[PDB]
Each structure stands twice: as structure tokens, then as C-alpha cells.
Amino acid sequence: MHEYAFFLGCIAPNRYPGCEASAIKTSEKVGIKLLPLKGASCCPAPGAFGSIDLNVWYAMAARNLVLAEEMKKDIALICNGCYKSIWEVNHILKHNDELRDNVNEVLAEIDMQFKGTIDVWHLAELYYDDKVCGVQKIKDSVTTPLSGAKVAAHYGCHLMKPKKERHFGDTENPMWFEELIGALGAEPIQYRNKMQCCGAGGGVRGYDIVHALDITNEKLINIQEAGADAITELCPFCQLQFDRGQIEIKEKFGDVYNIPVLHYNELLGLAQGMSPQDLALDLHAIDCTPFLQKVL
Amino acid sequence: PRIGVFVCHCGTNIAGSMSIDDVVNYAKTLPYVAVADQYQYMCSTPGQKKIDDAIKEYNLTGVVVAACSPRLHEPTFRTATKEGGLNPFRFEMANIREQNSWVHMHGMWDEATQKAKDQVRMAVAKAAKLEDLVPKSVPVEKTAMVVGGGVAGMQAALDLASAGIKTYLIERTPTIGGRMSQLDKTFPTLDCSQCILTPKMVDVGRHPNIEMMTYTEVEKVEGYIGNFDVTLRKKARGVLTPTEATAKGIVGGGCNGCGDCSAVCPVIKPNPFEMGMAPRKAIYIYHAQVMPLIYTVDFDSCVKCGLCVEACGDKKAIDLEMQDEFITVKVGTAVLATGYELFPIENKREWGYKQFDNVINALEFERLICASGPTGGHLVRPSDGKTPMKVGFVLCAGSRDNTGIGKPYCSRFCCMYSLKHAHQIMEKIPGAVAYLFYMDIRSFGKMYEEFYYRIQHEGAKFIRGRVANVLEDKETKNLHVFTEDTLLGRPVDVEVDLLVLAAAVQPNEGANELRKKFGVSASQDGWMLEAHPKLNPCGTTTAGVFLAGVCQGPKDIPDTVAQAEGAASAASIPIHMGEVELEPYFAMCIDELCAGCGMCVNLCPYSALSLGEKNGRTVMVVTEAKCKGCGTCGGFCPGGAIKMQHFTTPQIVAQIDAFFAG
Amino acid sequence: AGIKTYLIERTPTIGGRMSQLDKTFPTLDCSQCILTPKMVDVGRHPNIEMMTYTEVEKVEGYIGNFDVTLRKKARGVLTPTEAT
Amino acid sequence: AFAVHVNMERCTGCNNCVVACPVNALELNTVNPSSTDKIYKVINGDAVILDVKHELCAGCGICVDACPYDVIQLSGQPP
Amino acid sequence: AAKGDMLYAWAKDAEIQKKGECGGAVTALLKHALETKMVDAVVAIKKGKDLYDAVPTVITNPEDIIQTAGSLHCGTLLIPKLIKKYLNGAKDMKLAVTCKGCDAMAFYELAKRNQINLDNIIMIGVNCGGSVSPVTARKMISNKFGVDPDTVHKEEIDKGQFIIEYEGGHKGIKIDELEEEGYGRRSNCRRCKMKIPRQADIAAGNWGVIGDKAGKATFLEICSEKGANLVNSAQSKGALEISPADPKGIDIRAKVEKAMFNLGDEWRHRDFEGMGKGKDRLKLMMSESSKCIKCYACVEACPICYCIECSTKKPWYIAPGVLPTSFMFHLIRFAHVSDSCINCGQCEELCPMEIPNALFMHSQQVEIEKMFGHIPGQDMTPPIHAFVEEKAERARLDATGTDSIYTNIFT
Amino acid sequence: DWKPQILAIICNWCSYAGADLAGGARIQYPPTVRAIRVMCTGRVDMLFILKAFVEGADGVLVSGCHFGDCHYLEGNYKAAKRMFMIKNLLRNIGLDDRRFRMTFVSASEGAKWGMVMEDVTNTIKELGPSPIKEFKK
Ligand SMILES: Cc1cc2nc3c(=O)[nH]c(=O)nc-3n(C[C@H](O)[C@H](O)[C@H](O)COP(=O)(O)OP(=O)(O)OC[C@H]3O[C@@H](n4cnc5c(N)ncnc54)[C@H](O)[C@@H]3O)c2cc1C
Ligand SMILES: Cc1cc2nc3c(=O)[nH]c(=O)nc-3n(C[C@H](O)[C@H](O)[C@H](O)COP(=O)(O)OP(=O)(O)OC[C@H]3O[C@@H](n4cnc5c(N)ncnc54)[C@H](O)[C@@H]3O)c2cc1C
Ligand SMILES: Cc1cc2nc3c(=O)[nH]c(=O)nc-3n(C[C@H](O)[C@H](O)[C@H](O)COP(=O)(O)OP(=O)(O)OC[C@H]3O[C@@H](n4cnc5c(N)ncnc54)[C@H](O)[C@@H]3O)c2cc1C
Ligand code: SF4
Ligand code: SF4
Ligand code: SF4
Ligand code: SF4
Ligand code: SF4
Ligand code: SF4
Ligand code: SF4
Ligand code: SF4
Ligand code: SF4
Ligand code: SF4
Ligand code: SF4
Ligand code: SF4
Ligand code: FES
Structure with missing residues (x-):
């Protein structure tokens, strides 16, 4: 049973707690142990806080990293934006000496040092790796087939891009996340421009809601045209956009889709037999009941 | 010994960094120095006259010139030393310009003067110990080898043969011609490529002074400028030419190119000449215009069914049990003309080359548009066989790219051939429109700008924007090309029926292996390197090897032929x-210092050293022709039994001692 | 290659435009430094009849024999050979 | 020489994959046993395949047909 | 009997078996080879005078090898360089040579450099626990043992102590105690670790012979097919008796060999740190080497020095007449020999000026060895500079993790 | 009163070309190193280096072609092995082994030649005068 510190940023615990609950339960069912991070905070959200000040972005991400450093554990994440912040600041401060120095003399005011000893992983990346739980182990753990459901994957942008800074391979047409959805028994479908941004990154969600919603609506149109019955995602930002933004699209525009948006951990819980009440699917703006009728 | 020291000013390039008067007075007070003197341009005719007059007057044993680099002016001053009654090799330079002046210009003058005095002292110390050498003359075998049967190889072979030298033309493939044989029409004159080249192919095939050896490779090369012992691998063609058949005893002949064999062969495989678009049997020719019309057998795919031999009948040209024969050929010089291949553009995933059906590259487009290609010359969509009406051309596909996937250089001809293809589609399909997504149209050659003007006049659309990514419509299989029109200032989404990638070119497969066999180095770009990038673009640093064609760098057929x-x-x-x-x-x-240990023998890359019998003692023997003067053996030998002729240990140690003299 | 050659130049010196160039793209070498070796070779070659400051008045003939008439413009100064 | 994979998560230790494998049954149940190596042995309650390098299986399907709650997947394609 | 067998061997002839230090098997094998005409001569050590004088001898009469029987512990000489100089390198005649570990290593060094013919030479190797200089042994016996040295009959290093047999009885003193007091084995013998010459054709010793044969049997290890043939021929013609060795004997032979390795390591340590570190080692080396009078005895005695004319004799390296000679003289030997020094000590012990040539050279050799991984004198592996390899050179440049040869090379 | 005496032995085909290119490009560096110019670095015997160091070179530099880019196919592998062994000898005779280094400079690296010159000068200046010059006496 591999053990990881569970970073747990802002949106999953405070808006979609079923995501974190299913994360812990399903990760324990497969051979992974997710340990609470002691006093972790907002990973300085890369858009809304990196746009303001890169130095304080570095300092806060480094503080989050040195918490798990003192814990002597590897970070595990469930958010693409949190992955950007944590993993990328870890990578930058493992190689840039003057930035290490600057962050360290900022952190020395709170009796705290960064040395760069741990690694950062996304939970879906762990589920895909073969040393850690693999696709076959996921298939083994699945107990409810979830058959006869068309499911559209949204990769997001901060997990895989830029490919010159990550290690997940092709960004033009990846299929790895489609294999994790196929392990659950749901057939993943392909839609036009599947690698498009959801529109919520960089603080655009806050600065220009209509612009962000138009970017989201382009995706929703493509997904409905494909014929999806739900949208899996690996990011609480993207889930919030696809969930709230459907309501804001219904009100600001006149478009109705009613497409449930679920984190992959929530689908994994559904596959492994967790209850909809135990997943808190009532906390989503868009009702999941048609999808539950199909897969149950 | 009596040494003369002549210090050049190089026209203030040296006198503006040191005190030439002080250097000259120091040279006068140096030991062994008979005369020390200075001049403004020692490389000029008054400078050589000054050297010669000094030699005659002062009875000089050797000459030291404190001037520019030896790599620049050894031949000049060696010839000046010869003209004057000395050996050319009683001469030594002291580089006090490119290693003293130009690097110690600013704010440091007496330091540069001291450095110059030190360099002059070391040069005088070496020259006081140099002695006479006479260059070795070696005979040259009167044959030549040309590796590569493309336009550059064929032109070089025809040129040598018509000059009268017997020539070998080695081609790995069963036919000569190269890429130009695959081209359909040629920019900017729009001539048919096969029509203009078939004459020259016939000349090569008929020339008595050319030994055309197709379907053959170069296993190994040893030797030097004089004699290159080149071993060739005659791959098992499987079919006998009439000459070889008569030699083996079959009077009726060998292969006449009737085609019955391929008419009955049941195996069907892709044709590499047609870039895989077209079928060909196990026994085959690339196209109907191949120069040796001899019908190779593909032994990796033959099933030895024996139908081909029954079809051939009394001609008996097919020998299904043939094996790779090896031949050793002695040649005087060699010309390398290996050409090029298209860079693998499936690595650029944003342009769905292998993943979308209707995305092709420019050699596949050239085969599709040729009238002798898999289609009847009709460009049709690979996805469904329908005629396109909008065609996009992605220029710079994998080129001028610093991301590590593509090539950082320009492929030279891809702007021109894309213009040609746009013209061809607009004239062959009525009402079809060509879109060129370009980033610097490069029509630099003769009549190229006029060709560009004419294409724009016929109505090709030029969108200045590098393609960002390509999406395939799920149903119509049409391709959505996304970029920005940089001049218009807006993003664009052009939906085309067919997308053509003007991919970069790279050195052919196996070219690095062949150039390592011949001893040629590579450029920064990965192409074969030339002796001097400006004034010697054909020769290489290894003597007796010369470059021709795209193998030295991408070029059009005119430039390739001039180079050849x-x-x-x-x-x-x-x-x-x-x-x-x-x-x-x-x-x-x-020899009377060699102890016969034989340990130096393995230190020679050229195998110039061996153990032999002289006066009963086993001593080492140098093949002075094979030696290249590196000095590895002579730097090894513990007993000092190996002497390096112009860089002897006493000379080098005298230089060291003179450096530490104060 | 061994053929006797005439080199006609209208100007009093060989070299051309590259002699006027200061440095050369794409390698940034000094033009005269790289060319002077070759100018010296031309000036010393026994098989080259270097005729500077000379023009071609008329040409008649064909592939076999070209009867080329040259105008040796009045240089005003004698080379050592001509002086002797 | 195929590859068998046992889903440890639902293996009950029933040992009917060990008893039914005809390569395991070679040692004690053959006249003059040829090879005495064994694919499965139930260590700590789950079936462990000692045949790590996929040299002894013969794709018989006696073990896949034997496990009561299907848990053994047989791969007929090269690993 | 076959290339790896470990045997007990003694001579059939009772007189040969008495005069052998152990069972006379080296003298029975040499006699058999000579008289059955495997070899045309035999190069062994005999006493020329008192047992402190060891004289090499080429023997062709099979009647003279009984005089060669017995081991002289004061024989500090080296045989293979004499075969190259005065026997034409054994290029035309077969020889059978009795040799210690240093003499086997020297054979292999000279055969690498093509100076002898190991196809012709047969090497009967003896175990060696150390040799004493004859004059130092005399002073040892006069002072520490309190005996007149001319009284001694035999003398041997057995069980790590120096047993002498004189008229009156026998005595014994620990060799470690003697070596602390300033006597004992030679310095290079204290540092030596080539205790059982497994590169020779036969290895004979008194280690591992236990029980009823503790002083009348030689432990033989057959180390090659040539030695197997010699032994089988001798046993069949009946000049030598063979019984398979005792497993307990083999075990304690291994243990004594291993303990000798450890002692050699300890002496290597204490000597090499005794030389100093940094500029102190340069002042030690330079002040010692300023004594050299250019007798060239070190060059003429070194097995690795095979050059017709030494570079130390070339006027552009060493000024011919300047007697307080340059440090270049010894730098030229460090450069040429230190990569393959077999620690024979001849350079140290033949120096009129008492310069620690062997100590300096071995101190450099041990870590040229742990750098390049080349053990001198074991087999036909070419010297490190006579065989340079592309892949290995890449490997050492990449291991430094650097773009040049400047640092991150040593710990 | 003291100026470092650094001696360089540079091959003709890459290090001499690189130094010439640096000069042509007008890259300045201090005037402390004087070069010898042999054909290949395979020519460099160990006794050359040791002779330099015993005459009193405060530093010695040997510059050649990159691995795989020797004009004579493999002559700098021999030089590299020789210089590794020279580094070992100088460390064990107690002279400071950082007085010696071997750099691989290509024909086009004039800037790198200038940087090598600067770094060699700096290192020898830190190290100080060689001890042989006073140990001789
Ligand atoms: C799509 C496209 C269109 C073009 N259109 C034009 C055009 O319209 N006009 C124009 O002027 N140029 C055009 N070019 C450029 C033109 O093709 C080249 O200038 C020309 O072909 C160079 O010929 P080459 O002989 O040097 O090389 P190649 O033609 O490639 O010939 C090399 C030959 O050597 C052989 N060979 C390779 N390696 C070995 C080996 N190891 N041993 C033996 N033989 C070997 C190959 O099989 C081949 O036969 C075009 C290029 C492309 C890609
Ligand atoms: C500003 C500039 C910079 C350049 N820089 C570079 C550079 O960095 N690198 C590079 O590679 N190229 C460069 N070039 C191009 C380069 O100059 C040419 O490639 C090259 O000079 C061509 O030489 P040529 O012998 O053909 O012509 P020219 O050099 O012009 O030589 C022609 C010669 O013929 C003589 N002549 C003319 N008419 C007659 C006649 N009727 N009878 C007798 N003699 C006659 C002329 O006097 C002259 O000596 C540059 C060009 C320019 C204009
Ligand atoms: C200096 C020395 C130290 C030794 N130390 C040990 C030890 O610690 N442990 C051990 O087990 N064995 C040691 N031996 C070897 C020991 O003597 C063997 O047990 C013995 O050689 C067995 O042979 P043998 O009695 O059967 O034949 P022997 O009749 O003894 O034959 C001995 C042979 O050795 C030759 N010989 C004598 N002196 C020398 C010499 N100085 N150099 C070379 N050859 C010589 C003789 O000529 C003869 O051919 C040592 C030998 C020597 C010479
Ligand atoms: S010889 Fe060299 S330094 Fe002297 S004038 Fe000519 S180019 Fe200048
Ligand atoms: S049938 Fe025979 S002669 Fe005719 S093309 Fe085939 S091989 Fe040549
Ligand atoms: S042997 Fe059969 S498969 Fe081969 S070329 Fe002849 S007909 Fe075709
Ligand atoms: S020739 Fe034109 S299309 Fe080809 S790489 Fe250069 S700029 Fe791009
Ligand atoms: S020249 Fe030197 S290395 Fe070569 S065989 Fe003679 S002694 Fe040996
Ligand atoms: S110098 Fe020596 S090693 Fe180099 S090519 Fe000549 S003989 Fe061979
Ligand atoms: S398939 Fe057959 S041989 Fe293979 S493990 Fe199962 S029962 Fe055994
Ligand atoms: S038969 Fe099935 S449940 Fe029983 S041990 Fe084997 S794999 Fe497990
Ligand atoms: S050096 Fe070693 S093998 Fe030679 S005598 Fe001394 S201890 Fe014995
Ligand atoms: S033996 Fe001693 S004194 Fe004689 S040359 Fe060698 S070091 Fe000098
Ligand atoms: S240097 Fe001295 S100790 Fe080393 S092998 Fe030569 S003689 Fe023996
Ligand atoms: S020191 Fe060197 S040159 Fe002198 S003999 Fe020994 S190996 Fe030969
Ligand atoms: S040519 Fe420069 S190192 Fe060999």
C-alpha cells in the first residue's frame, strides 16, 4: 500500500466534498493510502494569484511543498490547477538556484526551509502508472459495470501542457484518460476539439464571465453533438466551470444541455459501488439523475 | 644554423597591438638568429623578395616569419622559402596576429609584446632544429567511383567518363535517377522531369567509360588519395542481365524486360518508388522508365513459388538462389552523392499526418499528380477517391523549427515546389483553389520571383501564417486548418479537402554510415561537411573524396548539377x-632503437604499422603511404624509436625549453 | 587539369567584388584573407597567362579554333619580364 | 508460454486453480514426472503465479474454467 | 592431473625427497622434464656459498638438479630479466623455470612486451611469504637472535616467524616483531599480495599440507594444461607420487592466503601514508631523488624497462653531464612503469644511493590500478596505453560528469 | 613580481582553428597562455607534460577535438587516457593536479576558447607559483 500526502486544495473540500471522499475511499480500495496534509492551504492558484505576483506564488507553493517535506511523503493531487502550482514550483525550485535562495529567505521568516526532496503526482497519473495501481487493477476493483453510458473526457490544460514542461506525452490527441473511463466500463466518446480549454483558467472566470462562458459553450455544443451522457474531468476548476457555467449559460444565453459533470474519482466511486448520497451528487448544479438511471 | 626572423605588421593589424621594433631587437639578440627584419605585408611580392634577398645575402639555414596563422599562409611562405635555395620545410611561423594582436588589442601592450617575444623565441627554437623533408609522391589509379545514381551522381559520372576516366556508378536501388525521377513537373520551367532526364539516363547506361553497378552497396573502404580499396556488396538481384547470362552460359539471353514474371507473380507489396501508394509484385521494376530494365526480385517477400521462372522460360533470367556477391575495386578518387529523404513529419502531431487520411506530404502529392503514378494522374482524396476542390499547402512543415522536433534550417526548395503544386492543381482541376499557409515565401533563384508572380496571378491564395493545428471533420473527412492571417490580423479556419505538408528534408538513410566509411565529417545541420565553406564547397578534408548534390545540403536540380x-x-x-x-x-x-615490442601496432587507426624482419631483429615497419602524420604512435613509444618528421620530440622539447628560457 | 589558360581582366587586378567585401556571411571570415591564397596561386601558376587590364576586341571561329583578338590597354608601367 | 493474470482483490484462496492446473498436476500425477515446476501456489490467501517469465502455461483454460468466481484472465496475445 | 586439481606430491627418489624443503616435487618435476626432454634447460636457484648466497643456474645435465633442491629465503633475485638478456628470450629453446610470485608477474610483463616466449617457458611457481636480503638476515641473526651467522644450517619463515637451525638447537622470533625493530622481509615483500602464483603452470607450497605429511609433501595446484601434462607424465613415469589433497588442507590454505592479503594491505597503508601527502610528498620525492648518481641499475633491473635506449639517456630530456640530476629522471620512470609495476623491489634494492624507488613506484601503481582496473602480471592483457578503447574513453569522460578533464575525477 | 607561466599544446584541426576563430572574432582574453601547436593531441607524449612541469610551468593545458571529431579518427582517445594518467601521477607526487587540464574545443568554438583561456588563468592565479621552482634549489 503506497502512501501519499493528499493535498486537497480549495474547491474539492469546500464545494464538491464527494470528490475528496470518493478519492480517499477508492484510492484505499486500490493499493494507495492518501494521508491528510497538515495545515495545507490554497495552492496559490496559478491564474488568479500568479497573474498578480509570481514571487508570492513561489513562496506559497513552496510552503505547501515543505509541509509534505516535513511529513516525508510524496504529494498526491486531484486538481490540474493545483498540479500546475505545486508540481511546477517544485520542478522550478529544484533547478533554479537564485529562486531557491529567494524563496528560502522569504520562508526563513516563518522558520521553514525548502530543500526539494519529494515528488508530486496527480491521482489519475498514479491510477495509470503500472508500478502503482494500473488500468488492470482499476478494472479489477470495478464492481458495478456502468455499461451503456457515453462519457466525454475533458483533460484540462494544466496537467498535460506545455509538453516541453511535462512528461505525459502527446497533447494533440491523448487516450490515456479515455482508457481509465474505459476501465470503468463506460464507453468514452470523441467530440470535436476535445483538447480545448474550458475557459475558466487564468482568472478569466472572474474577469470576464461572458467570455469564459462562450469558451465553455463551444465545448458543451461539441459534447452534446457527440452524444455524451456525462463529462468526466480531472480538475475542480473545470468541474466548477462546466457545472455552474451550465446554469449561467442557461440564464445569460438560452442554451439548455443538462449534462452531468463528474470528477473521475466520483465515477470511480460509482463503479466501485459507492452510493450517490455518499458521493454528494446533490451538491452539483446539474442533476445527475438521468445518468444514474442509465448506469444503475 | 642561421635563422632569419621577418616580422609582419599586417598593415597596423599587429603594429597597433605590439611594439614591432622591440620584437625585432629581441629577435636580433636571440641565439642562432642571423638577421631580423620587418615589413608591412610579408605575404606580398616585396615581402617574398625580402625573404629571398635575405636568404641569399646572409646564407640562411632557416626562416621564421612572425605573422598570421600557419593555416592561412604556410603554402605562401614555403614556396617563398623554396624560391631562394632552401627546402620548403626549413620554415616555421610564429602566429602573432590571430593569437596575440586580435586578442590583446585593448589596454595591454607591453604584455602583448612579451607574448610576441615568447612566440618568436619558441618559433626560432623549433626552426633551429628543423631539417629537410621532401613530400611523398604517390601514383593515382585512373578510375573513379561515384556513390549515388541521382541527378548529381549521374552528372558526375558522365562528366568523368567524358573526360575519359573510367568510372564506377554505385546505386543501392535497382535503378538510377533519384528523386528527380519521382518528380512530375519541374519548377520554374514546368518541364516534365522524366522527359528531361531520360536522355541522360540513356547516356549513362550506354557510356563505355561508366561501370553502372545498380543495387549495390559499399561495405568497406581502406586506402588514401592514391589507391582506395573499396569493397562492394552486389546484392542478390535475382535476375541476370544478358551479359551475365551469356557469361554463365545461357546463349538465349537474360532479362529483356518483357514483364511476364511480374504478370504471374502472386505476391503484392507496396512500391517504394510510388511512396507506397501503388502495388508491385515480388519481382518488379519501380517504373517503366528505369534505366537497367532488369526486374529485381524482392527476396524478403518472395515465396519461391517458381511461377516467375516458368514465365521467363528459355530466357532463364531468374535465379532464385542468388546470394550477395562481394567485389573489391581499386579507385583513385571518390564522389559522394547520397541525396536526401523527407523528415518524418508524423512526429508533429498537431498536423495529423498519419492520423488523418487526407493529409499527405509533397512527394506523395508529386506521385499522385504525375500521370504515371498510382492514379491516372488524377488527384483524388485518399479517404474516398473523390476529386478535391480546395487544397492547402503547409509550408515550413518541420523547418526553421527550434523546438527539437523539426529541423532548424530551411530546406531551400519547399516554397518553390509548393508554388508548382498549387499551379498544377489549379490547372488540372477546374475551379479548384490552392491555399498556401506560408511564413516567408523564398523564391530567390533565376526566374523564381517571376514564377511566384505568375502563380499569384493564376490565383493561389497566400495566407501569411504558420499553421497552428489541423482538425478532421468526422463525417466529410475534410480538414480544418487553424492559424492566424498575420497580415489580415485575424484568426482563420480554412476547410480544405486535401492538405499537403511541405516537409523538411534530411540526409538519406545510411548516409552517416557511408560518410564514416569514407572518413567525412558532418556539419552542424547534419549534412556532409566541405573543406572550406566558401571557397571549396565540393572537396572534403579527407583527400580524394568529394561531395555532390543534396548530400552536402538541400539544393534545386540546377545547383545540384553545378555542384556535381x-x-x-x-x-x-x-x-x-x-x-x-x-x-x-x-x-x-x-630501427636500431626499436625493441620489437609491437605495442605501437594497435595505436594506428590506419594500420600503417606492422612488425617485420630487418637484420634478424624484429622491428616495426611504417607503410609511409598509409601513415597520416597524427603522431599517436610516436607519442606512445617509450624508447623514442619513432620519429615524427616535422614535429620531432627534440623540436617540441626545444620549443618547451625556449618558452621557459628567461 | 593541365590546360594552358588565358585569364583576361579589364581592370589592373584580379579579385572582383569579393576583394571589396570586408567579411563574408554566413561564417564571418575576412574576404581578402581567404582569397589572397588563391590570388597568389593564380599569379604563380605556370599554366595560367594572367592578362590584366586587357579587353576582348573581337572573336571569330568555332568550337575548334577561336581567333580571339585582345586589346592590351596602355598600362604605362612595365613588369620586370617586359622590362628585361 | 502465455500469460495469466490473477485479480488478487477478489481471490478467496479456494486453491481450485492450483489443484486443476494440468502443469501443476505433472509432478505427483504422472508416471516418471517430466517437469516439476508449478504455475500457481496460494500464499497468504491469494493465488500467486510463480511462472513469472511465462514459460510453462499452455492456454488450456482449465484454470479459468475452474475458479468459481471468475478472477483469472487468460491472455492469448504475446505479453 | 587436470587444470585445477589440488594434490599432495612428493618425490619417489628418497634423496630428492630429503633435500626438498617439503617433498621435493619441484625438483622431481624439473628433473623429469629435463630427462624426458620436454625442456632443453632448467633455470633454478642454487646456493653458491653459505645458504645466504643464491645463484641462478642454467642446468642441462639432469644430474645437477639435486643441487638446486631446497628453498633459499635469502634469494631476492628476479629470473625473467636474465632469460631475456643472456638466453635470447627463450626464443629458440624450451626452458623450465622455478619462479616466485614476482618472478611469474615479471614473466607475464615481459611476454606482454614481446621480450620472452611463454610458449617455450614452463613456469613452476612456488608460494612466497617473503624474502630477506642476505646481509640484513646476517645482521638480524648477529643482533636479535644472538647467534654467529656462520653457524646457521637452515633458516625459514614458517607460521609468521623466523626459524633458524644452528648447532645447539633452533630459535624463533615473530616476523612482525622483527619488522617493527627494522629487519625482516623486504619492504616490497611486506606490501606484496601475490602469494600463490595462479598465473604460473604449477603452484607448489607448504600451506594446506596437514597431518602425517606435514613436512614430507608439497601442496600442488595445477594451474594450466601444460602443468597438467607435466604432472601426469611425471606420475606415470614414476618420478613423483600423487595423492588428492585434504579438504581441510584446502580450507586452511585459503585462510592463510587471505590473512596474508590482509597483512599486505596493512603494510601498504602504513607505508603509503608514511610517505606524506601534498607538497610534503613532493619534498620527500625530490629530496630523495636528488641523490641519484645515474647508475641506471633501476632501469636495467626493472622487468618493465625493455627499451633499447632509455629516454633518461636522451640529451633533450636529461643533460648528459649534470650530476645532481633533474627530477625528470624519475618522472620518466613514473610515467613509463607505474601503470604496470609488479612490486619486485629490484629498483629499490639495487640503488647505491638507497632511494625508495619501489615504494614510490608502488604507491603510484596501486591507484593507477584502482583507476583503470588493470592488474599487472596476471595474464596477456595489453598495457593500458598499448590498448586504448573508444567506449572506455567515452565512459571515463561521462563518469566525470564534465566537459573536460579537470575535476570530479578523484575522491 | 610573479606572472603565471601557462603552456598550451593545441591540436591543429580543432583547437588551433578555434583559437584562430576567437582571434578573428576579436574575443579578448588575458595574455598568459602560449601555445605549441602539434598536429593531433595523440602526438602529446606524457614526457612533454612532465618536462613542462619540471621546467616550471605553473599550469599546462592540452586542447583537442571533441570525442568522435578527431581529424585522425581516434587520436584524442589516446590523449585522453594519457592525461587521465598524468592527473593521477601529479596527485601522487604531491603537485596540485588542477595545474593540468585537457579541454575539448571544436573548430567553431572561439567563444569557448576565450572562456577556457580566462578560466585557466584564474585557476592558476588562485593556485599560485609552482613548488618545483623552489624545491630544486
Ligand atoms: C517534393 C519535391 C519536389 C521537388 N521539385 C523540384 C523541382 O520542381 N525542381 C527542382 O529543381 N528540384 C526539385 N526538388 C529538389 C530535387 O529533388 C533535388 O534538387 C535533387 O533531386 C537532388 O538530387 P541528388 O542526386 O542530389 O539526390 P537524390 O535525387 O536523392 O539522389 C540520391 C541517389 O543516391 C542513392 N543513394 C543514397 N544513399 C546511397 C548509398 N549509401 N549508396 C548508394 N546509393 C545511395 C539514392 O537511392 C538516390 O538514387 C524537389 C524536391 C522534392 C522533395
Ligand atoms: C555588398 C555585397 C556584399 C556581398 N557579401 C557577400 C558575402 O558576405 N558572402 C558571399 O558569399 N557573397 C557576397 N556577395 C556576393 C558576391 O560578391 C558574389 O557572389 C561574387 O562576387 C561573384 O563573383 P563573380 O566572379 O562572379 O563576379 P565579380 O566578382 O563581379 O567578378 C567579375 C570580374 O570580371 C571583370 N570583368 C567584367 N566584365 C569584364 C569584361 N568585359 N572583360 C574582362 N573582365 C571583365 C570585373 O572587373 C571583375 O573583376 C556580396 C555582394 C555584394 C554586392
Ligand atoms: C624466498 C621463498 C619464500 C617462500 N615462502 C613460502 C611461504 O611463506 N610459504 C610457503 O608455503 N612456501 C613458501 N615458499 C615455497 C616453499 O619452499 C615450497 O614449499 C617449496 O618450494 C616446495 O617445493 P619442494 O620442497 O617440493 O621442492 P624443492 O626441492 O624445495 O624445490 C624448491 C625450488 O625452488 C627453487 N628456489 C630456491 N630458492 C629460490 C628463490 N629464492 N627464488 C626462486 N626459486 C628458488 C629451487 O631452485 C628449487 O628448484 C618460499 C620459497 C622461497 C624461495
Ligand atoms: S602575412 Fe599575414 S600578417 Fe603579414 S600582411 Fe599577410 S595576412 Fe597580414
Ligand atoms: S520474364 Fe524474364 S526476361 Fe521477362 S522481365 Fe521477367 S525476368 Fe526479365
Ligand atoms: S518465385 Fe513466386 S513469389 Fe517469387 S517472384 Fe517468382 S512468382 Fe513471385
Ligand atoms: S524553402 Fe520555404 S517552405 Fe521550405 S523551409 Fe524554407 S521557407 Fe519553409
Ligand atoms: S617502435 Fe617502439 S612501440 Fe613500436 S615496436 Fe618498436 S619499441 Fe615497440
Ligand atoms: S602517425 Fe603513427 S599512428 Fe598516426 S597514422 Fe602515422 S603510423 Fe599511424
Ligand atoms: S492455462 Fe492451463 S497450463 Fe496455463 S496456468 Fe491455466 S491451467 Fe495451467
Ligand atoms: S481459483 Fe480463483 S479464487 Fe481460487 S485461488 Fe485461484 S484465482 Fe483465487
Ligand atoms: S615480492 Fe612477493 S612474491 Fe616476490 S619474493 Fe617478495 S613476497 Fe614473494
Ligand atoms: S638505481 Fe638509484 S642511483 Fe641508480 S639510477 Fe636508479 S635511482 Fe639513480
Ligand atoms: S619499478 Fe621497481 S618495483 Fe616496480 S616493477 Fe620495476 S623493478 Fe619492480
Ligand atoms: S624508463 Fe621508459 S624509456 Fe627507460 S627503459 Fe624504462 S620503459 Fe624504456
Ligand atoms: S585532430 Fe585535434 S585532437 Fe586529433
């Missing part, structure tokens, strides 16, 4: 003379 004839001329220079002088830097074994 230049290489043929350079390869003919030593063959016509019949003599060639080697540089007397060889290793010479001092």
Missing part, C-alpha cells in the same frame, strides 16, 4: 596528373 560537375572536375584534377604529393609528416621508425 564541380566535384567531377576536382576528382579529375589528380587523375589527369597521375601524381599527387602527400605531406611529409609521416612516422619513421629508427
